[PDB]
From Swiss-Prot:
Gene Ontology molecular function: actin filament binding; calcium ion binding; calcium-dependent protein binding; protein homodimerization activity; troponin I binding; troponin T binding
Name of the protein in question: Troponin C, slow skeletal and cardiac muscles
First and last residues shown, out of full length: 1 to 89 of 161
Organismal lineage: Eukaryota, Metazoa, Chordata, Craniata, Vertebrata
GO BP: cardiac muscle contraction; diaphragm contraction; muscle filament sliding; regulation of ATP-dependent activity; regulation of muscle contraction; regulation of muscle filament sliding speed; response to metal ion; skeletal muscle contraction
Keyword Acyltransferase included in the entry's annotation: no
Amino acid sequence: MDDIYKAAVEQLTEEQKNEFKAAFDIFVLGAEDGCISTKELGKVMRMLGQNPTPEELQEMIDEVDEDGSGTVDFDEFLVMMVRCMKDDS
């Protein structure tokens, strides 16, 4: 009845998202067309600074990819980044 992940991408300005675009493409080989492998997010998370553990990143994906796609895109990965840091949940 509120959805907090909707604002997560609504707070990032095009000038900000572009920052991830440069790194996101670092691991998008395959996965539909513009998605990375849940196993690559690790190197992508510590690439900008955030160094979360893989034990928590995998679980989240299981709840994010109900279809077990095993691959996130700029639409899913973003939710994981705003869900790892703080501020506005």
